[PDB]
């Protein structure tokens with residue numbers, strides 16, 4: 001089927017998976033060096049073997065595609081993937097206007113204490129983030145993220161570069177450029193970074209008709225993160241192809257360390273009792289063009305027939 | 317054999333190779349999205365099917381490994397791979413102390429005129445480069461090259477970062493870091509660049525014993541450049557492993573556009589009538605350690621039994 005690539009990685013790190021101690025502490029099953037290719041003309045690579053949200057994907061891709069580092073857009077898009085992160089600037093609070101949030105996670109795996117306080121405290125944070133321009137200014141704003149790396153590279157000699165777009169206009173004027181890369185790995189920055197970008201670089205290609213993409217993703221969580229990553233960059237492949245007046249071809253996913261967590265083995269195995277179902281279709285709106293201006297319903301994903309969601313633990 | 321990977325790419329771009337018009341004008345056969353893996357414990361991946369110089373490789377790797385942008389080291393190492401490049405600052409000469417060198421190449425494919433003048437003019441340039449500190453200062457110095465990208469990242473807020481070494485000390489203190497990457501793709505710089513780095517990024521890995529490397533190489537010339545690239549990064553894999561007190565494992569080569577030139581087809585085919593020969597051995601000196609201090613004979617490549625060199629045209 002179109003997603004069997006990912007079930008071949010799921011089986012491979014289970015089979016040839018080496019244990020390597022990881023950061024987010026369970027211990028993991030690693031591989032190093034892996035490419036996977038998806039023909040985006042046969043379907044949209046959301047996973048039919050498990051329910052992956054096309055909605056939350058969507059809202060975070062648009063956030064990136066605008067230049068936003070701010071939590072408020074995503075918050076008012078019911079999207080919480082980067083939420084726990086505005087909260088780093090909440091928790092270290094010289095403006096601590098209150099209580100136990102001192103280490104939030106970890107014991108938020110532990111039912112009352114850091115657990116459900118932190119959890120009612122998300123609305124406390126997620127309220128001023130969304131309703132208080134001032135708050136939103138300061139604690140809801142993730143400095144370097146995907147968004148400003150792809151769109152506002154803090155240049156050396158006082159300024160900013162928009163790699164995506166600058167690249168989009170080379171995808172429109174000089175097609176066969178071997179030089180259509182957008183990097184998120186800036187040397188200067190990476191010494192001080194809570195998450196340094198797991199999706200380091202990618203590169204566009206157009207070959208007789210088609211917009212292909214390749215991803216260099218270095219730390220890839222096979223259960224929980226790779227499913228999404230295939231879909232947020234097949235999406236981009238489509239978004240950009242449709243700006244440039246191109247047809248689509250393939251999405252190439254290259255991993256550095258692609259790893260299973262020890263506490264997601266039983267589940268990935270659970271997923272692997274299911275057979276795929278025919279992949280989705282992606283129809284974007286034909287009138288809208290500046291991909292920068294796209295909004296939520298300029299992308300529908302039709303025909304998503306998925307097995308239920310399987311539910312993790314965490315990767316922390 | 318250990319190099320059959322590269323003969324499988326050589327056959328693949330010949331077979332599935334799509335024509336794509338290229339920059340360096342013949343026209344080319346492209347693929348996009350390709351990984352190749354070499355087990356550096358079975359051998360050193362220099363190509364027995366054709367004579368690839370281990371010597372010139374060597375001298376340019378050391379140049380990189382020090383921090384040098386200057387042409388003079390390589391010049392006094394009989395190494396001319398980056399020579400035609402000091403000569404960009406010769407040819408645009410406000411200090412033109414002389415004659416026809418006005419467009420050097422192209423008609424240097426054409427026998428007297430730009431041809432053998434330019435060619436006697438290399439000693440003219442390659443003399444002051446090597447004997448005239450002042451000259452060497454200015455026209456022999458390739459600003460951003462591999463060397464200062466890997467070792468002296470011109471930081472934003474007035475300074476420099478040494479990604480390689482800073483990474484080497486994380487390969488020594490925190491081994492399982494998924495974060496051991498050195499990039500050569502700096503956004504700021506790439507707008508103005510005659511060659512923007514074809515070997516964009518790479519990443520180190522240590523898995524139960526071994527130093528693995530992966531390369532993200534975007535524009536790869538399968539006949540003329542890939543043979544080398546395998547060997548200059550297997551070398552690095554070894555150089556770094558031997559600083560850190562590790563054994564070696566694999567070198568992963570990922571390509572973006574891996575392309576044949578139209579005028580190298582007959583030759584790559586010529587190479588493919590030959591069968592491999594057992595790969596080399598690489599013995600570095602056991603006393604020297606700071607890989608930064610290594611010199612020419614702290615690396616011998618034993619047992620190189622290669623078929624003759626096959627001889628190109630150019631890729632320009």
Ligand SMILES: O=c1[nH]c(=O)n([C@@H]2C[C@H](O)[C@@H](COP(=O)(O)O)O2)cc1F
Nearest residue numbers: 023024195198219220221225226315494
């Ligand atoms: O977009 C992402 N995709 C992904 O797969 N991870 C993984 C999950 C894992 O828990 C985290 C930590 O990796 P490292 O220790 O290399 O930072 O990287 C994180 C992201 F932000």
Ligand SMILES: O=c1[nH]c(=O)n([C@@H]2C[C@H](O)[C@@H](COP(=O)(O)O)O2)cc1F
Nearest residue numbers: 178339340511514535536537541542631
């Ligand atoms: O280290 C290198 N390796 C390599 O394979 N090339 C290729 C050869 C080709 O002629 C050149 C031009 O590519 P682009 O048009 O993408 O600059 O890239 C160039 C290097 F510098």
